[PDB]
């Protein structure tokens, strides 16, 4: 069963530090080199630095953009390895992935979920969330509802719908970023038999702030 | 640094029929060990890579037998036998023989179906909202295609441009179709010095906008 997670990153002050951190499972992690990754918009995916197995020296290569700011390590014992990034700039902005190149001539063949790096001077903010509820008689056969996430800082929120048991006509679209901070909105449609007379609820979390906001959407 | 290239940013291609997705080196990848250091990966919208094809042609662990891979030197062909609505994400090729690794740009799947006009909602602003000083608007324009849409909001029947925030999903991975949420932000006061609003979508599937609207009034 393998798996990488990534753990450690999130908002950070612009000339700051922060430690990101890969726990390795299911897999021989010892015999395998691991390397961080990153993605933005801008350059797509950029290598970032990778550091070998014992046998290997434990040999560090980085990208010359982050050399001498930044420092890959790894502890066999615990089956991690870590990205120990300083004098941060807007532009390490981005999700990083740890991967791992298990035995010689396999490729990234395992990859972690990702965690985002804001490198930013805004502060952490709360989202508030609106119900949005159609304003006519519903027929027909389908109406759409949605959960409007406004004024939180930075990404990412989660939004489910009835704590995840409707997923298949839901949208949850990218959030915007202007003056009021992040607006992002969520739509879920289901039967006109299903709403009003079921409770249709938005479940807001923003792991940031560890606010978590439930909402109702009630015809108005 | 080598330099990868995927010409095509994206590619069009119906469920069922065969595609492929071409990417150069600006070295040769062939290894003095014999090997040709380069892979291919998936990421689908939301979600982390994943390795499809490593060393040219070797198909990774759980990879569906419609992958193939072929190319030598500096270039390379990454072939799907018969495409499906779930592939759609960005395919990025990889040179893995020289330090910095370096990837291609991507070229995005993406999956032609019928056209589909968009299912258009439009919400006045929650109660809630209002007590709070804010007014704004909300339009889904939903499960649509082709992509390409446009969204114009009228105040009274003007056109208002400033204050307004569009956002798109990616394609989706079962119906192959498109939605945008757009919309139009005012304060309370602003929203109140008028009554009529609109969001009106203008999409291949109709010469006639579509028009959602209601009345602050009501
Ligand atoms: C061109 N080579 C060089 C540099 C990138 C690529 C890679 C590869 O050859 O697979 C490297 O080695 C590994 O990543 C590896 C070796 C043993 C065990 C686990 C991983 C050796």
């Known amino acids: 069963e393998v798996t990488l997670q990534e753990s450690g990153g999130g908002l950070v002050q612009p000339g700051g530090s922060m430690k990101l951190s890969c726990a390795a499972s299911g897999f021989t992690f010892s015999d395998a080199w691991v390397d961080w990754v990153r993605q933005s918009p801008g350059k797509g995916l950029e290598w970032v630095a990778e550091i070998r197995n014992k046998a290997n020296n434990h040999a560090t290569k980085y990208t010359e953009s982050v050399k001498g700011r930044f420092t890959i390590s790894r502890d066999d014992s615990k089956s991690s390895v870590y990205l120990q990034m300083n004098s941060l700039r807007a532009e390490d902005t981005g999700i990083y992935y740890c991967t791992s190149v298990p035995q010689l001539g396999r490729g990234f063949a395992y990859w972690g979920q990702g965690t985002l790096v804001t490198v930013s001077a805004a502060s952490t903010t709360p989202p508030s969330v609106y119900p949005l509820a159609p304003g006519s008689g519903g027929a027909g056969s389908m109406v759409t509802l949605g959960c409007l996430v406004k004024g939180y800082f930075p990404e990412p929120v989660t939004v489910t719908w009835n704590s995840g048991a409707l997923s298949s006509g839901v949208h949850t679209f990218p959030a915007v970023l202007q003056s009021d901070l992040y607006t992002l909105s969520s739509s879920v449609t289901v039967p006109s038999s299903t709403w009003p007379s079921q409770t249709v609820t938005c479940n807001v979390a923003h792991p940031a702030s560890s606010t978590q906001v439930d909402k109702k959407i009630v015809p108005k | 640094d080598i330099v990868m290239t995927q010409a095509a940013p994206s590619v069009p291609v119906t469920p069922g029929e065969s595609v492929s997705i071409s990417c150069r080196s600006s070295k040769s990848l062939l290894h003095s060990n014999g090997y040709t250091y380069l892979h291919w990966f998936l990421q689908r919208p939301g979600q982390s890579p994943q390795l499809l094809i490593y060393?040219?042609?070797n198909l990774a662990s759980g990879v569906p037998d419609r992958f193939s891979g072929s190319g030598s030197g500096t270039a390379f062909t990454l072939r799907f036998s018969r495409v499906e609505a779930e592939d759609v994400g960005v395919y990025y090729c990889?040179?893995?023989?020289?330090?910095?690794?370096?990837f291609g740009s991507g070229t995005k799947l993406e999956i032609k179906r019928a056209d589909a006009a968009p299912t258009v909602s439009i919400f006045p602003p929650s109660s809630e909202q209002l007590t709070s000083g804010g007014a704004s608007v909300v339009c889904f324009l939903n499960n649509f295609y082709p992509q390409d849409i446009t969204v114009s909001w009228k105040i009274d029947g003007a056109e208002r441009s400033s204050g307004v925030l569009n956002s798109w999903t990616d394609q989706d991975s079962s119906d192959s179709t498109y939605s945008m949420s757009s919309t139009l932000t005012l304060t309370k006061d602003e929203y109140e010095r008028h009554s009529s609003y609109t969001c009106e979508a203008t999409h291949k599937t109709s010469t006639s906008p579509i028009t959602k609207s209601f009345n602050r009034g009501e």
């Open positions: 060393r040219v042609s």
């Open positions: 990889m040179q893995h023989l020289e330090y910095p690794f370096t």
